[PDB]
Paper text:
This molecular generator couples ion flow across membranes with the addition of inorganic phosphate (Pi) to ADP thereby generating ATP. Like the analogous complexes in other kingdoms, it is based on two reversible motors, termed F1 and Fo, connected by central and peripheral stalks. In vivo, subunit ε is believed to change conformation in an ATP-dependent manner to prevent rotation of the complex thereby conserving ATP when its concentration is low.
Three different conformations of the complex were identified using 3D classification in RELION. State 1 was further processed using masked classification with residual signal subtraction with a mask created by removing parts of the detergent micelle. Three out of the four classes from this classification containing 95,345 particles were combined and refined to generate the final 6.9 Å map. In all three rotational states of the [name] F-ATPase, the εCTD had an extended conformation, albeit with a different proportion of particles observed at each state (46%, 30% and 24%), suggesting State one to be the lowest energy. All three reconstructions showed the complex in its autoinhibited state, with clear density for the εCTD extending deep into the central cavity of the F1 enzyme. To ascertain the enzymatic state of the F1 motor, we generated a difference density map between the cryo-EM density and our built model. Remarkably, clear peaks were seen at the nucleotide binding pockets, indicating that the non-catalytic binding sites in subunit α contained nucleotide, as well as the ‘closed’ αβ heterodimer. These were modeled as ATP and ADP respectively based on known orientations of these nucleotides from high-resolution crystal structures.
Residue numbers in the entry:
A (entry chain K): 46 to 127, 140 to 268
B (entry chain M), C (entry chain N), D (entry chain O), E (entry chain P), F (entry chain Q), G (entry chain R), ...: 3 to 77
L (entry chain I): 2 to 53
M (entry chain H): 1 to 69
The structure:
Amino acid sequence: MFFSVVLGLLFLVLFRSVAKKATSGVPGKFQTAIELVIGFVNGSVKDMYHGKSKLIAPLALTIFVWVFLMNLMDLLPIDLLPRVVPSADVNVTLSMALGVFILILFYSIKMKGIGGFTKELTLQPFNHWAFIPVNLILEGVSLLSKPVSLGLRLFGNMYAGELIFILIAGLLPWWSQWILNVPWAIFHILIITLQAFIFMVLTIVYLSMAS
Amino acid sequence: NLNMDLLYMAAAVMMGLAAIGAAIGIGILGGKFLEGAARQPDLIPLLRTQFFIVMGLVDAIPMIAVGLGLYVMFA
Amino acid sequence: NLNMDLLYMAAAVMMGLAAIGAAIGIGILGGKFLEGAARQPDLIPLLRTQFFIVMGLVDAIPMIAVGLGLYVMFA
Amino acid sequence: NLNMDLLYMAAAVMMGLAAIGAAIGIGILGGKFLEGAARQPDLIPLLRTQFFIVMGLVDAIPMIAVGLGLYVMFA
Amino acid sequence: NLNMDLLYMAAAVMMGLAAIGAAIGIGILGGKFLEGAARQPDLIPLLRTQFFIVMGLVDAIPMIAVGLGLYVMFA
Amino acid sequence: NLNMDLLYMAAAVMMGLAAIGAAIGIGILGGKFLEGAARQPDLIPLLRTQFFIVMGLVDAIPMIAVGLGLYVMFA
Amino acid sequence: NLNMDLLYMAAAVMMGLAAIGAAIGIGILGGKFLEGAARQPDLIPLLRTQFFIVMGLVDAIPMIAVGLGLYVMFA
Amino acid sequence: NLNMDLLYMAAAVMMGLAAIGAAIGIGILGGKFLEGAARQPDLIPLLRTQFFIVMGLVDAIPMIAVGLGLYVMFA
Amino acid sequence: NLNMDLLYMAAAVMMGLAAIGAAIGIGILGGKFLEGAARQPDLIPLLRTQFFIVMGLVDAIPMIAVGLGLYVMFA
Amino acid sequence: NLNMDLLYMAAAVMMGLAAIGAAIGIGILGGKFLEGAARQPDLIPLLRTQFFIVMGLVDAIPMIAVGLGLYVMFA
Amino acid sequence: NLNMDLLYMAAAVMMGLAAIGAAIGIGILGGKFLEGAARQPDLIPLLRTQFFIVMGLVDAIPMIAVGLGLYVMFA
Amino acid sequence: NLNATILGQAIAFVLFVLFAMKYVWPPLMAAIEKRQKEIADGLASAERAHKD
Amino acid sequence: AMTYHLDVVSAEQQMFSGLVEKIQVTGSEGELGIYPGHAPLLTAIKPGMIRIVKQHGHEEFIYLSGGIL
């Protein structure tokens, strides 16, 4: 399944690269040019923590950092020239790990805190408040689906964006247009990844505050 | 033919006109963020997260329109 | 054919144009929240719940439009 | 066929476009509630009931549109 | 058939789009009532009757639209 | 048949969409009356007659639209 | 038949939608008159004639639309 | 027949909808004139000529629309 | 015939609806000029040239619409 | 014939209606420039470049619409 | 033929009308930037980045509309 | 990614995190902490000494 | 109706003092009254008698020469 299996292979490779690069450069050096940046990441990540802060701080902190790292993999395909069947269903694959992991995440806070021991009680006087079950139920379902809908929607929006900018650039015989698009699209991409970490933080600060 | 023609017309209708509402609404929010921060600079870290929440909720209404557009084009 | 073509055109019409009203309306509310908190920061926990109530009521009008759209597409 | 096609097109037209008016109007009211309470916090229990009355009257105009939509779909 | 199809399309057109004007207009008035009372609480019994008069006059414009809609559906 | 179908579609078009302008415009005026009286209560008997004049002039534009609608339905 | 049907559809289109602009515009002017007189009561005899001039110029744009409508209906 | 029907529909479309922009725009200007003179009465002879210039430029955009309408009706 | 009918309908569509944007936009600018000069009369020779630049840029958007209209009518 | 007729109708649709957004948006910006300079004349060389940037970004949205129009007319 | 005609009509619909929302929304933001900087010049480096973020988010809604337009024209 | 490639890709992510925590977080968290403890330390010493 | 901390004062003379939980007074630009719980703000008011409910339901119209309260 080249156009398929080759794709999952690709995204898997990126994720591994994240894993090893972590401990490897982390034992060293960083050093200082490197150290200071690591400070931006970790410390800005701490300011971000406050807000959700303590609950997932190891769990979510490690995660979001890994999310920037793994998220850069798409920038790599954009960075390539700056032909597929890695990155199409490797991008679908990332949308699946991320969005699937998000549906998983609602549960992970659910059991991790109540939250979910209390989430079964979500109906509550809230379904009585608001006395109709249609309101509370449509709301909660729209929430669980909506978390997946939002996160997956962002993921696929990103992957698709990659595919499209790629198309515009590659088909055209004239290079200049492809360049301007690709540069603008590149700023776009970086913004998108940071926006992703922010989105994880948004779902998470949700979780701390959510119910 | 008639069903295919109807899909392409329907895709144009649902994609463009509804998405105008967030094009305006995302801008309304950022104008409020800029005016609020200009009037009171110390309130920046309090209202910036509100602006992001609000922009994403406004952007979700077009993403619904775009979703129907893509269903009509490709589903 | 004619009935199926009418469904796809109708789905585009009801989905996109009505949803513009909340795209604007959700943004109007968040702009009021941002401007109100910038003018008086101590009123944040009082008006934030009002903003959520109000955003959900505005978002329900498009969800009605989207509901008719989905009925036309899939019912 | 032609009558059935006309019903589905008519349902899309009446459902979506008119409901934009409350999507905006419900939001206009909540923005006034938030701005009024931010300017004068002691007036909250006086104007909150006004906001509810006003939101329901604005929401009734789309519910009329939705009613015609449902008549066209199911009556 | 063609006349009946035209009735159902016409009913959708006249019902939904015109009623947006009061959905917005009823809300504009209540926003003015809320903002006026927040700025000057002693003026509440003077301007509340004005708000009711004004809401009913704005609501009459859609009721005209709805009337034409019902004539097309049932007359 | 075609002429009769055109009358019913035309009646829907002219009745609903134009009447939105006064639904909004009657409300704009009453919002100005409420805000003007809240700011300066002594000016109430001076500006109330202005509001009535102005509401009637705005309401005449839809009554023109409604007139064309009724001509199409019944003339 | 086709030409007659086109006249009745065209009459509805030109009559209703354009007349919304004065329904709003006549109201915008009267709101300015009411707010200006509330802020400064001594300026009433200066700005009332301006309001009349301005209302008539705004009302002339729909009267153009209505003129085309009547030509289509009766010419 | 088809060309003649298209002329009458096109005349309605171009005449009414575009002329809404000046119906609103002429009113926006006169509202600014009234509010500016109410705030500062001594500036009346300076800004009245500006209002006339501005009203005529806004009115020229519909007169373009009306011109196309008349070409379609009579040319 | 069908191509000629499409030209006349297309000319009406592109001429009227887009030109509403400058009818409003030219007026928005002149209202800002009038309000700015009323608030600060000494700034008149500084902002009058800005108003002219801005009016011409807004008027160019309809002139584009009118250009397409004339191409459809006469090209 | 049908494809050619569709091109000319599509050119009218995409050219005129979307270009209204900058006709309004270019004017909104120049009104902000005029009002900002009237309130604080010393800020003129700071905000004039902002106005130019902003006008060009708003004007690019119609130029997209015009581009599609020209593709439909000539491509 | 019918499918090709539907593509060209759909391209015009989705390209032009939705892009009006950013033409307005990009301008709303720059007007807020200009007014905020005029009121408080020291806040320029804080709110300029907000304006850029906000303009790009508003511009993305039309770029979605344009994307559907180009798919209809060339895909 | 017709079947199963998406699965492999995702597992690489989950395990990637676990490896970070076990190894990086030991190497990363601790290795990075040196500047925190250090700057914090020199500053603290300064303040106390000056005060007393 | 007495409020919490209120006084009518000039350096020359304090006109009144103590709390007033209701005060009818005409703001220079708008309607004025006193009632607790409103937010902090500053204004001036035209001259005239200001009828204010004060402690133990004392209420009186106090002629203003107008000025910034």
